[PDB]
């Protein structure tokens, strides 16, 4: 409602670097807010795409940003009569970024990995890897829970059980308030998908450069399954956390599986031990139900509510015809120990192929009325197809069915304006939470400052 669409702020990266593919706010030890931006096709040293991360100080004018430097060199270790190998070419560093406390977690989901033992090998597969940084001190660390040293022949003998070679860990990322990093790995267990959790402090303390294969004892990975409903489900495409069981000491996980049960799509709510509490099934096949999940209390009862995006949902129209427009589902958490019922509200896009619901950002309380609000993105929507971000305000009965404000893309055609969103942080310190929007197609980020309600 009260986002200023006139005086925007634009940050920009190098051409073709996909600057803005992912973003987040970052507060330093002094509470100063900055913006961390991933650019998963930033050129490395060998003039080859490796990705990169930028840490942008807040300026009303915007501009260029300094790089948050990471080691982009391929690594090799000859240990235990074996040869360990990491390959950082086309790894997509910055395909997801997330900040917690004074720590930045940037992930390269397509970093490849292989192990050689004489004439056998583990196969060069994308296990993924995340890089951690404390910008004020200069500390660095890595976390790659799917790296293994099992040779290819063994996987075939054991029939590919517990095969973590294609995890692509870091595809999606989130950090609990207690500091436990939760990584989505949609390719784990032969494209079933897995989740990896470990404390941030233990990642830093148990990491040494050049080891390549090391243990994090406090880590916890999800479990393989023989149920075909999970086959090629990409369980872990999107991840989020919240409180859904009434006990405030436990933290619950929300996992998107957009091709679960033969492309039906599903979202599951689990405890910290990966035991399933609820499962929201998709409505329409190939809609990619679970492409994006968001957690925030919208109706102001203190109980977190769940939002699910299905950006390929095809709406029914006249003459038995279907129009791919996208849809968002709202689930309000009931009072006490009860199951999440049918959706409380259906928000459906308008522009054909607009992919409404591709990104959902909790905004906090934008208009300061007492109810939290959200932003939904249609990266190819709007009358021109340049992209749209729609703001929906919270109310006592859930959300308003019509938007309160619509942000049209200030970038040319094909910028994917809205593909990545982040809100609920006051960056200019005026008392109102603000919204950053990524447009990786144009290699830019736009900052919308919230203003007093007109």
């Amino acid at each position: 409602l009260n986002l200023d669409p006139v005086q925007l702020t634009f940050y920009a990266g190098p051409n073709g670097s996909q600057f803005g593919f992912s973003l987040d706010f970052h507060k330093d030890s002094h509470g100063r807010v900055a913006i961390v931006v991933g650019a998963p096709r930033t050129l490395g040293p060998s003039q080859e795409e490796t990705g990169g991360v930028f840490l942008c100080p807040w300026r009303a004018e915007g501009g260029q940003c300094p790089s948050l430097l990471f080691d982009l060199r391929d690594e090799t270790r000859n240990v235990g009569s074996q040869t360990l190998q990491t390959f950082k070419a086309r790894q997509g560093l910055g395909a997801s970024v997330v900040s917690w406390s004074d720590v930045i977690v940037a992930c390269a989901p397509w970093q490849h990995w292989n192990v050689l033992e004489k004439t056998e090998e583990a196969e060069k597969t994308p296990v993924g890897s995340c890089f951690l940084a404390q910008p004020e001190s200069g500390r660095r660390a890595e976390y790659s829970p799917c790296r293994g040293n099992t040779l290819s022949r063994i996987y075939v003998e054991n029939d590919f059980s517990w095969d973590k070679r294609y995890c692509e860990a870091g595809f999606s990322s989130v950090v609990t308030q207690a500091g436990e990093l939760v990584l989505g790995a949609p390719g784990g267990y032969y494209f079933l998908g897995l989740l990896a959790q470990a404390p941030v402090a233990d990642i830093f303390s148990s990491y040494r450069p050049g080891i390549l294969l090391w243990h994090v004892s406090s880590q916890s990975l999800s479990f393989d399954s023989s149920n075909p409903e999970y086959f090629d489900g990409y369980w872990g495409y999107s991840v989020a956390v919240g409180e859904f069981d009434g006990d405030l000491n436990t933290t619950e996980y929300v996992v998107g599986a957009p091709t679960w049960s033969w492309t039906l799509g599903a979202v599951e709510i689990l405890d910290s031990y990966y035991q399933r509490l609820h499962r929201l099934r998709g409505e329409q096949m190939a809609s990619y139900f679970g492409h994006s999940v968001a957690v925030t209390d919208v109706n102001g009862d203190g109980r977190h509510d769940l939002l699910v995006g299905a950006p390929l949902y095809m709406e029914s129209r006249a003459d038995r015809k279907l129009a791919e427009v996208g849809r968002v589902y709202l689930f309000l958490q009931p009072r006490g120990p009860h199951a999440l019922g049918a959706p409380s509200l259906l928000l459906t896009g308008t522009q054909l192929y607009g992919r409404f619901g591709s990104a959902i950002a909790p905004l906090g309380d934008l208009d300061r009325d007492g109810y939290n609000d959200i932003a939904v993105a249609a990266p190819y929507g709007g009358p021109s197809g340049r992209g749209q971000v729609l703001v929906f305000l919270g109310q006592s009965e859930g959300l308003r069915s019509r938007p309160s404000q619509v942000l049209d893309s200030p970038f040319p055609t094909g910028s994917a304006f809205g593909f990545s969103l982040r809100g609920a942080v006051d960056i200019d310190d005026n008392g109102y939470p603000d919204l950053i929007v990524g447009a990786y197609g144009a290699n830019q980020v736009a900052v919308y400052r919230a203003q007093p309600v007109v």
């Epitope: 270790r77 000859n78 240990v79 235990g80 009569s81 040293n149 063994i154 054991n158 148990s206 990491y207 040494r208 050049g210 080891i211 294969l213 090391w214 243990h215 004892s217």
Partner: antibody, heavy 119, light 108 residues
Framework: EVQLQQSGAELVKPGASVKLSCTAS????????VHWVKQRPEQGLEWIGR????????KYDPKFQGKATITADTSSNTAYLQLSSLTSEDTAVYYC????????????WGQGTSVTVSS | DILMTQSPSSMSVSLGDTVSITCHAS??????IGWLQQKPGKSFMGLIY???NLVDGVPSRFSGSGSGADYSLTISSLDSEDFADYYC?????????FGGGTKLEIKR
């Protein structure tokens, strides 16, 4: 805390067999590799072999091929080292080892089991 | 197999001295070396892994260094607990092999 508690000292006759144990304390035995090392005052330390308790796959030094058999039961959180056709030269102290962070290291050690072969 | 030549066999030193044990391999092992300690009539304690990295709980007066096939364990300002046996171990190749050992003894 990581602690490896082995079996008590054994006293056996030559030609017989013995099965040592190594129980994990404060963690899951399935987490890392588990090695076995033999110690004698003259010959010093010798590496017997390892096992991955998650799957049961073992490696051995060709010297001990035949006498040493390493197994693991994730149920009791315990690893085992079986010695067969015992000899006077098998009288030694035996340790089980596991790494800290590095997958291939040798950091945490049990207290040791004293074996004595004699008629 | 990789031969670990650990020298010296023993040394007579005193409290507060700065001593240095060395370990020489038959080929390059690229920092894939560990250091052990065995107090008299007791079990082993890990000191260094991957050439230079301290094991959790080990005081900072220990330090590992070296490259290729020559490595060094150094103890700055000896304590009364530091008089014991010390072994190097390589894990660059299977089978793992150990050094002969080095015994620190009180000088008088």
């Amino acid at each position: 805390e990581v602690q490896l508690q082995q079996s008590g000292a054994e006293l056996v006759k030559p030609g017989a067999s013995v099965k040592l144990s190594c129980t994990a304390s404060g963690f899951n035995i399935k987490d890392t590799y588990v090695h076995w090392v033999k110690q004698r005052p003259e010959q010093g330390l010798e590496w017997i072999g390892r096992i991955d308790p998650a799957n049961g796959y073992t490696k051995y030094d060709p010297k001990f091929q035949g006498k040493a058999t390493i197994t693991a039961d994730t149920s009791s959180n315990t690893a085992y080292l079986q010695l067969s056709s015992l000899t006077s030269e098998d009288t030694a102290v035996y340790y089980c080892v596991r790494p800290l962070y590095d997958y291939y290291a040798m950091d945490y050690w049990g207290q040791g089991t004293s074996v004595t072969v004699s008629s | 197999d990789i031969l670990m030549t650990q020298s010296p066999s023993s040394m007579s030193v005193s409290l507060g001295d700065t001593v240095s044990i060395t370990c020489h391999a038959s080929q390059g092992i690229s920092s894939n070396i560990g250091w052990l300690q065995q107090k008299p009539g007791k079990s082993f304690m890990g000191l260094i892994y991957y050439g230079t990295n301290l094991v959790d709980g080990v005081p900072s007066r220990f330090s590992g260094s070296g490259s290729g096939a020559d490595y060094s364990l150094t103890i700055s300002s000896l304590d009364s607990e530091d008089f014991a046996d010390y072994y190097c171990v390589q894990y660059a190749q299977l089978p793992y092999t150990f050094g002969g050992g080095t015994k620190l003894e009180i000088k008088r």
